[PDB]
Design a binder for this molecule. Structure first.
Ligand SMILES: OC1CCN(Cc2ccc(Oc3ccc(-c4ccn[nH]4)cn3)cn2)CC1
Ligand SMILES: [Yb+3]
Ligand SMILES: [Yb+3]
Ligand SMILES: [Yb+3]
Ligand SMILES: [Zn+2]
Length: 607
């Protein structure tokens, strides 16, 4: 039933375990290894199973200790290639057989990003990291690349003795390689069933420091110190999150601070989450991105989406818990401010992509469409917009959180669709069905544009941001002298970012307005990756030539697509930077991430 896959569905075949024995050769830029898939049959007399590949070369397929005949079909863009494996002898229902595939990756694989020592914040050692979400585990190893299949895994990775190898699992051992003395083999065990898109590897000159009874923060020697401070609230957040979903059954929770290159704020990888170094502002304000990945240990890591059309079930429900952690740490005044900010981001994505556009619906049709392209603010904020509306109809926070605690409990270790969620939303609230029936279902789930109902948000914290935003938009030439550093003497870092976000929706503003802002507030001096981003966009949209060097620099400074893609598109629209925007892309294309370079290129109209 999964459009984004070329393999046999869960109804025909199901993978139960995976044993990965590989080596990381940085000279060759490949992942030399053998994958042992303890595959189970769900049909009587199964003669052949199909698997997902992309940029792979197979040496041999070993079943029962013998070479078997395998066939690889014709390549289909982002989906990759189907790998039909002819079985030696037919399978019965629930009959488990191991398949050892001797794969070989590509140095230009869409999942892995190979780093030159110069690209790292160590300058003396190389770095390697993956990103299997959504359809990129096929670019690492041949498997049933579908979130309709949850599997366990045990792994052994051979890397040089001078490096540290880490996976999305709990570590077991540490011993040197037998037929390579300059190498060390690291063991990883994942007893908890997890889909292939959540499997991740990271190798490099890493170092760890404890920040609580179950957390380890991983980054290079000269990045550990501020990593310990910025995410020091993780232990307290986890204790709060447990009273929202249930027990934390993963053993250890770790944070891994990636090099700038990483294209996402955070990735929900179990036992070892993936975070961007841009989160480090030094004040602990970007801590909500940690609250999002903690919340993912319940939604996405326990209750996973069966197909990618139902992705909103992951992020949307996670944004609810993320704001609830912040709404138990900083109050309901903050939870409502963030929820109001969410609609704001949603408005920006709906106006950009288009109102009647297909990728603005909550359940979209990913037939002949790449999920990495269709990624926007719709499954995050529109998915939350639904939940917050339901909450303000069925009761309140305590009542709706009670539904989610039962929801995680009901579909734990399982892969579900939007149809499965709506049944439980009607089964849990079996007495408040009258309220549930008032809700237009086709308008929130299958219709494009803004949702038909805008919920009620507490404007207590948000009003100040709007007051200062409206002050600038309404201001004339003579009015600009009224603005002083006094203006933001009470506005917080989140409120300063909200003011910039509100102004950017009404951008471009006169060039004199922008110039004045820097003369009194000094927005260039700030090191907050969220504040700096919107401010740079505001100048480039308003045609400020002084901002061109800074705007280009921020896009090369980091790899997060939340900030790089807007910048490179902004400078492409702006006449005095259109050439530089293109020139920087092609000169930095080699150093870029295979996902970052792919999406930026299309937005710049470059092949
Ligand atoms: O923190 C996370 C951030 C995102 N991933 C990468 C990623 C990209 C796309 C994706 O698949 C999608 C996205 C949106 C929709 C959709 C449905 C209705 N509208 N839009 C459907 N499928 C899944 N993962 C990395 C870690
Ligand atoms: Yb052990
Ligand atoms: Yb039902
Ligand atoms: Yb005036
Ligand atoms: Zn997420």
């Amino acid at each position: 039933v999964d459009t984004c896959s070329l393999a046999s569905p869960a109804s025909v075949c199901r993978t139960k375990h995976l044993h990965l024995r590989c080596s990381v050769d940085f000279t060759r830029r490949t992942l030399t290894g053998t994958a042992a898939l303890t595959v189970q049959s769900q049909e009587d007399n199964l003669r052949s199973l199909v698997l997902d590949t992309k940029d792979l070369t197979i040496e041999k397929v070993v079943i029962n200790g013998q070479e078997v005949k395998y066939a690889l079909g014709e390549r289909q863009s982002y989906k990759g290639s189907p790998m039909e494996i002819s079985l030696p002898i037919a399978l019965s229902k629930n009959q488990e057989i191991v398949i050892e595939i001797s794969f070989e990756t590509s140095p230009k694989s869409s999942a892995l990003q190979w780093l030159t020592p110069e690209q790292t914040s160590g300058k003396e050692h190389p770095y390697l990291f993956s990103q299997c979400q959504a359809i990129h585990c096929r670019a690492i190893l041949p498997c049933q690349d579908t979130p309709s299949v949850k599997l366990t895994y045990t792994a052994e990775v051979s890397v040089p003795k001078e490096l540290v190898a880490l996976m999305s699992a709990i570590r077991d051992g540490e011993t040197p390689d037998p037929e390579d003395p300059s190498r060390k083999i690291y063991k990883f065990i994942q007893k908890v069933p997890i889909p292939c898109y959540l499997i991740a590897l990271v190798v490099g000159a890493l170092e760890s420091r404890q920040i609580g009874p179950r957390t380890l923060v991983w980054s290079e020697k000269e990045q550990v110190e501020k990593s310990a401070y910025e995410f020091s609230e993780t232990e307290s957040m986890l204790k709060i999150a447990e009273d929202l979903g249930g027990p934390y059954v993963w053993g250890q929770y770790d944070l891994l601070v990636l090099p700038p290159s990483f294209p996402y704020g955070g990735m929900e990888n179990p036992c070892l989450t993936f975070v961007t170094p841009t989160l480090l502002a030094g004040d602990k304000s970007l801590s909500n991105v940690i609250a999002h990945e903690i919340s993912h240990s319940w939604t996405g890591n326990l209750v996973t989406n069966k197909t990618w059309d139902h992705f909103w079930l992951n992020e949307g429900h996670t944004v609810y818990l993320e704001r609830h952690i912040c709404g138990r740490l900083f109050g309901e005044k903050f939870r409502h401010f963030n929820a109001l900010g969410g609609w704001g981001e949603l408005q920006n994505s709906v106006k950009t992509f288009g109102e009647t556009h297909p990728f603005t619906k909550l359940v979209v049709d990913l037939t002949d469409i790449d999920p990495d392209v269709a990624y926007s603010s719709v499954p995050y904020e529109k998915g939350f917009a639904l939940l917050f509306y339901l909450e303000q109809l069925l009761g309140g926070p305590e009542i709706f959180l009670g539904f989610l605690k039962a929801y995680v409990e009901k579909f734990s270790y399982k892969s579900i669709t939007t149809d499965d969620w709506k049944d439980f939303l009607y089964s849990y609230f079996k007495d408040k069905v009258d309220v549930l029936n008032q809700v237009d279902w086709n308008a929130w789930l299958y219709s494009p544009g803004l949702p038909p109902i805008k919920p009620n948000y507490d404007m207590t914290l948000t009003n100040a941001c709007i007051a200062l935003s409206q002050r600038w938009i309404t201001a004339k030439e003579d009015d600009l002298n009224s603005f002083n550093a006094t203006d933001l003497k009470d506005l917080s870092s989140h409120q300063l970012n909200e003011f910039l976000a509100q102004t950017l929706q009404r951008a471009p503003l006169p060039l004199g307005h922008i110039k004045r802002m820097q003369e009194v507030y000094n927005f260039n001096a700030i090191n907050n990756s969220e504040i700096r981003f919107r401010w740079l966009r505001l100048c480039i949209q308003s045609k400020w030539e002084d901002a061109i060097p800074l705007a280009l620099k921020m896009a090369t400074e980091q790899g997060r697509m939340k900030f790089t893609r807007p910048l490179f598109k902004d400078l492409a629209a702006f006449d005095k930077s259109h050439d530089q925007a293109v020139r920087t892309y092609q000169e930095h294309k080699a150093s870029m991430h295979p996902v970052t370079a792919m999406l930026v290129g299309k937005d710049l109209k470059v092949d």
